[PDB]
Design a protein around this ligand. Sequence first.
Ligand SMILES: CN1CCC[C@H]1c1cccnc1
Ligand SMILES: CN1CCC[C@H]1c1cccnc1
Ligand SMILES: CN1CCC[C@H]1c1cccnc1
Ligand SMILES: CN1CCC[C@H]1c1cccnc1
Lengths: 400, 400, 400, 400, 400
Amino acid sequence: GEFQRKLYKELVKNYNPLERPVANDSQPLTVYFSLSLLQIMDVDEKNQVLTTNIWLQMSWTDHYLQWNVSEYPGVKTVRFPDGQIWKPDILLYNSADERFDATFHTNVLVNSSGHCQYLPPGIFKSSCYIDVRWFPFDVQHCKLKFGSWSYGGWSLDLQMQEADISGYIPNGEWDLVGIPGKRSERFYECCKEPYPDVTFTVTMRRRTLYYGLNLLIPCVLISALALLVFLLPADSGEKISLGITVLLSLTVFMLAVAEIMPATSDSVPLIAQYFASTMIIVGLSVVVTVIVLQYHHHDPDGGKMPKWTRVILLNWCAWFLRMKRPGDPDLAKILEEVRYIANRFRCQDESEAVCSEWKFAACVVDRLCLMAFSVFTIICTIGILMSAPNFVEAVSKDFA
Amino acid sequence: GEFQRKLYKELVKNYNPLERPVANDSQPLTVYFSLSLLQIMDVDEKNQVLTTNIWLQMSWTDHYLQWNVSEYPGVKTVRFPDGQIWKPDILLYNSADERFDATFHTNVLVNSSGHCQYLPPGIFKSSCYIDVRWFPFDVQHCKLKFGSWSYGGWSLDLQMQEADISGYIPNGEWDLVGIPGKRSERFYECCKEPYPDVTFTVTMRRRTLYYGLNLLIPCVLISALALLVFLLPADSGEKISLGITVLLSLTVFMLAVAEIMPATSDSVPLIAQYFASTMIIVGLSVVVTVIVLQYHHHDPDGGKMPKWTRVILLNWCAWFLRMKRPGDPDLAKILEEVRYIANRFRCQDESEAVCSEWKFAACVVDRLCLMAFSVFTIICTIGILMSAPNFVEAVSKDFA
Amino acid sequence: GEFQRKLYKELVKNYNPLERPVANDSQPLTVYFSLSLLQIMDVDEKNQVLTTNIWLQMSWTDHYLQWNVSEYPGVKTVRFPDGQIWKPDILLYNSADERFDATFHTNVLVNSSGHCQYLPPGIFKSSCYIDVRWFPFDVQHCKLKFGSWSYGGWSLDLQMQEADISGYIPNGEWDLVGIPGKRSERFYECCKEPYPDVTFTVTMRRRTLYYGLNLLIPCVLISALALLVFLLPADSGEKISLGITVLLSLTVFMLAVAEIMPATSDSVPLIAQYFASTMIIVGLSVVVTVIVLQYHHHDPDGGKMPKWTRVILLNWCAWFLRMKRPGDPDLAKILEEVRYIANRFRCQDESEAVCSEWKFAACVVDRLCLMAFSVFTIICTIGILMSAPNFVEAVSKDFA
Amino acid sequence: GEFQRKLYKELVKNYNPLERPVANDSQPLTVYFSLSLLQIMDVDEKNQVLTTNIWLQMSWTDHYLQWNVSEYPGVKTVRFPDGQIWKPDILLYNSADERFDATFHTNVLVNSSGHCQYLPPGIFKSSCYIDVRWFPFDVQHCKLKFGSWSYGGWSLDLQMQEADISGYIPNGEWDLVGIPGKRSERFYECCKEPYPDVTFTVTMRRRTLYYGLNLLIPCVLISALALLVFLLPADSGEKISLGITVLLSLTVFMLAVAEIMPATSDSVPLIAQYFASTMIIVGLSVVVTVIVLQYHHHDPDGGKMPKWTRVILLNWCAWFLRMKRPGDPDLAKILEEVRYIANRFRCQDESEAVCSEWKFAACVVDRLCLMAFSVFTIICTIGILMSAPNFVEAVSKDFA
Amino acid sequence: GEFQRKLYKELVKNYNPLERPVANDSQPLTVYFSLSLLQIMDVDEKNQVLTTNIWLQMSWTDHYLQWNVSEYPGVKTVRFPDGQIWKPDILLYNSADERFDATFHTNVLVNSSGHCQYLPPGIFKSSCYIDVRWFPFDVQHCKLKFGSWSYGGWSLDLQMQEADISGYIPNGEWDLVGIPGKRSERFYECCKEPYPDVTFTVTMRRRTLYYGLNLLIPCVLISALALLVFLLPADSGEKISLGITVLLSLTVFMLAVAEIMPATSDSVPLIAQYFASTMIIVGLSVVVTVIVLQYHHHDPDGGKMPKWTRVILLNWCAWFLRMKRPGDPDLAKILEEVRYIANRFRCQDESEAVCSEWKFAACVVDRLCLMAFSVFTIICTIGILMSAPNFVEAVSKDFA
Ligand SMILES: CN1CCC[C@H]1c1cccnc1
Ligand SMILES: CN1CCC[C@H]1c1cccnc1
Ligand SMILES: CN1CCC[C@H]1c1cccnc1
Ligand SMILES: CN1CCC[C@H]1c1cccnc1
């Protein structure tokens, strides 16, 4: 329209985009900075980066971009692109994006009274410290730090407004707790001018249903299946195969899991302690199986059992476990021949009885160690999962 | 030509690219926005992003870009590049691209009567929520939201035109159901001006031939092969090897499959429930194999078989399964010695008969558990695959 | 020089880069579009993208960029950068590149008679449909679609010149069959003006030496090694171990291979059918092994063999395979005692003979199934590899 | 304000951004270059690149950007964007980034006396040589080299200021030792003008907790578990299964670990020597197990054991290990028949005794080799981890 | 300075950046092109791309950028940025970078006599053909082709200068042999003007320490460990387990290695032939193990050992290997019963002797095949490693 064309022609006249738009130079310019979180697109524990889709919200009063609506009846707002009117250079301080500024420079709306608006979208990559000590039951506080890059306190009086999450779309992995902000004033070694900033802390809680179903449950099942070695009879040579192939499967699983975790050394992750406990339990099960097979394939001629181990393993554990404890010259010379055969058979029977007693001792050791291992693994897993704080509320919110 | 050069020289004179091209400022400018889907290049279930190749279509009437063809005999249309004539700043709201605007700014055609056209191509990355609950038999509704960024209802009267899929090239993985649109008016906390938008919902159905052939069928085959442990005779100490190696192979398969799935916690994926069922079946088969081997290698001196289990496992299951149930002083002193040898042989035969009865009990348990496991596996797989809606039509469209 | 400086000063005078350089506006401008393929740097079967290094070739006549060499003795050509003289906006329609235009805008040569040249290089990512039905013996026809984006038939009369492959450097994976093209005229729903285009079809044949050596040969070898179970005597407890560890190795191999193939559902890949055949063969090998072990470890007291299976497996298969078929009162009291011992030995010998006959039946079953499985594997692999068209010429060109 | 607008209008007048801002052309311009490290975001051992988030700090005196505050009462500092005032072209020489300059060009503050400030942020990818010889106990010295690209010693007198690490945020993997620098003057083959530069050496020590917990400890555990083959009795045919499955698990572990190390050939990494030692230990354990099984399954009819090995293995090793060393015509016809049976039994017993002696020799060899292997593996691991310098202080700082 | 400002103001006056800076238009402009290699940052065998960090060096005489130092006492050189003075459009022809030009356009120094310098840095991605036939002992000749894109021979007389490698930093993987260049003149189909170019061949030799320590040595070790199956006594059912687990480990290793090689079909890589030999050796070892177990578990009643195999395997191989070759009515009725028992024992002894002879034949076959396999493996590995040229000098340079 003619009025809009005239207004645009007269508005840009004698206008310097570099100049700070204030009537009095000494007075600082008030800028209201806010944020509009839309989606936590991705968080990278390994890379310690947080990818978010947010809309920055900036607003300030421009002294030069004013006009009377009476002379321009139809024109109420005007929009200027990048590089034609003054804009605050508000950057994300802790940015992990290859280009330090990830905003998409859009137009700037202008009141009929000089008030300006600026909502540049963009996907921000911020380097936030991520705790995996309580993985997967961890809550994260990733900070977004915004502030003017080259204007100080006396120039650009930055002000905070509450972050808006009305348009936030829920993420399938992270539950948002809140996004509070805090306005802080910080000095710098360059200059004697404070540089105010606005810091937004994105507190988000990880939803642990997928991790509990795909990481914790399979390890519980495989560890419990490793205890089956203590039910296999030793006569079938499959105990070591069972134990060691279970160990190999656990090795593959733990390798795949560790493929996705940060190489941080601040503390031992909860899942790392859990996997260490499972590995130790399986290894000690294999060691006990080796001991049991030593006690089972014990040659009777090797030597008599020690009295102490004999009495304890055949009395105390049996009482505890309620196990059942098993149990003319030609004529004379033929007689002595049959005597040799019969005595050989009797000696064979005695050796067989000794070996059977050794086998029973192996079985008793096996059963007692099965009970001990089952109790220990249950107690250890329960304790490890109890140790994580907010674990009960994570369970209540996800599973229940 | 001379006429075209004169027209270009005169048309740009006193033209402001910022001004909205309307004759009456109060009246809003009508913009007809459409879309031309060409190809669904990629969808990322893990990243919850949808990559599409589309041509945006905008059209509006420009009051200033008008001329009489009589004075320019050969010139019917003119073309302006980016930044020289007014263009709507129609952006994809839910964009997951590193740069928020993925369009390639092309030329802009103009009528001889002022009507304008604008078809900027580009590959758009939009963050759409992806449901894996019914994976791989899921239908996806990924939304594309377009609307002016700085112009409200009273400024840019955005309108919807039906999406064009004439040039759409079929994708090898996803079957397009449709791309309907909906024009909605939404308020914002910034301003008291409604901002109309156009939302296109891309309804896509996944073609399940590849997934059924490469994920489901191998699991059915391996789970069925795990049941072979219940046909191996216990004498060959290989049952545990069979079952455990099958479990390890399934572990590798499920790990590789889960490598491609999003870490969402809204619901348990169908294939996740299926894998859980297969893992449980294999583990229970291994447990039953351990019990069977306990029954097989039962020492006759350990104790008499309990009356209840004896009667049930030797009468009821045998009747059910129709199994066959098997079955001077020198002379006298030599006599008593040969009596000893024969009595030893008779006791050995009695112990052998008891052990054989134990072995038959183990075989009966093994056979009945084979039948139970086969029936349970078939029923569970059929039910899980039935639970997915549109499974029947997916099968009919893909396989048949 | 002075002449060149004067020519450049006078040439740009009253020159509009937007204007189409024609003397008569009504007549269209003839543009000769060609292409110079140099290297097929990459083709992504999984992503359905083709990455090529090509030089576009454009040529047209400028009415305004003309001068007389007499007044400029030294100057024969002039060069203009991007954005200073008119250039056709010829884009790759089916572009899968993040930026829709991948050309590198270079200088533009000009005749002394107005003729123009333009050879912008660039690496083009085009989305071409890729058939893996005959993989790895497949030939691919990936299309490149070029045409003016905003000029119609009456404005830019696009013409075609044959593609140049003189400078093409051979690829180590793909053998170029040819790059023919076709110039087509297509209408659009926007406008009543046809838009001519030039489509180049890149027909390339995959060289199958690497794939045959690294995928097909190892699977033949592993499948053949799986048949060794039918030579292992059943006395050594290793048959299921062999079969199932071969199955696990094939599982790893097929997983690694399937990691590289697209998730298309148009048809079952040839290598997919081949792997399915190998998996079925190994699975049935394990099943037959379980059957043979059932036959081998058959208790003699379990029951007499069925007459039909006895006669067939001990006569017909033996004849076929030419197998060798194996085979005072004290005196009376001692008499009856030794009679008992010898009768027990005779019964033991009878049971041993029955069990040995069962073992021979198992051996005969094993041998006949070995012959059947070897024949079936050879026939199936030969048929599957024969089914692929141009397989014989692929072999002749690669191996021979 | 009016004063700010007048100052900006008058300051840019007759200003040339290309000109070096010095009053006397002959005198060089002093530029103070510093650095502000904030975070070592990522280091890539495989790619030999270091990714850091740093703020360059440059400052110089501009002769033309001076004004009297008396005439501009409110204006104390002014800010210019990129391309409008002279800036030093200080580039990172050893840059491994796709674009050689990774800085984000921000504004430049200016004193009321001409002093200028410039703190452009950016994420810098520098190619630093990385030593993996002492991995994971290595300390890295990655260099950052900065200097003017086109200004020599007589033009831009580059000067140094100490690097600032007040704002440094600790990294979860690398402990910063310090960031000292050195200012060096270097000639070039192009020109006879020295080019001063500022080189900052980023000395960082790797925190070892995660690597020791996830790489070293599992290898210790698996190697120790491989020694259990020397406790399993040879009667249970599971020794080779144990050894070879442990070897396969170690193969998987070493493959996964070697996936993350560079293909560096200056020296053998410490973890590489460690894995080589573990592989040798496991392989030699398998070889010794094969020898032990040869000794155990020695047919008595094969031949008498050599006198030398007999005496040593049954006297010296027994003394060392304190092992218990185990241990009418009708009447005549029946007579000689029973004589035959008893003589057969006696010969059988003699052969059994010889085989038992062979088995005891195998057991003694097995035990002595167990002791030798345990001692050797402990000594080798201890020595390898001792060989790394600063290992003790790394352990003290991380674990303790 | 005032002199510098005046010089810059006067120099740009009547200066056209498009014009070629020559006094006489007819004579070509001489441009001296060189290169300064700094680091071979990365080479991609799979992608056939070479990533280098180089500084292009260009120099030419500008007729217009001349001044007398007498009138400008302090000004000796001036610097112009991109787009303000003429620069050769020298591009890397065989560029594989997404943007065809990877240079970073820096400033451009100028003499006081008109001579000009230009050293743009940048990381260049070039598509160079990579031979993996002799991998890992291969030497690579990757070409970099530079030349003016738009200027021909009569316009821009491109000239060569020797490449500079004084600042080259050694790479941890590739040993640089040299970077010779060659200036060639090549015609094009577009134009009748030759286009001179400068081609630099980067000859680099791969350092084989890491590859020989992580790829070759483990394969030698695993292949040698596969031969242990020929020392295991057949009585312990672990031969097939050993051989097949070794084969599975080799499968995993070869899959991981083949993950990193190009899918080229020009020729079979040396490491591929090596892996084929190892796989064949292991598979044939498994086949021979199956044959040995057939010979060992040969029932005596199947049939007499054939005369030919009997004589050869019990005489010739025994002589070769020097193996030890092992070895009233009541009375009469009781008599005949004991005769039956004794005859049964004698027949059992004869069958045992026949079985022992079969076992000895199996042992003889096993030992001879062990010797054959060891010799064949050593010979094949030595020959394959010898076949690669420059292998001896690669070993001398890396290991020694
Ligand atoms: C607060 N600003 C942003 C970081 C440092 C500081 C600053 C100070 C002076 C010039 N540039 C930047
Ligand atoms: C609808 N627009 C796009 C998102 C917010 C809104 C807006 C309003 C005012 C200034 N910028 C953006
Ligand atoms: C052929 N052109 C390229 C694709 C669509 C078509 C077109 C028509 C009108 C305006 N822009 C584009
Ligand atoms: C040598 N130049 C580079 C490749 C082709 C040739 C050329 C010729 C004319 C116009 N542009 C490029």
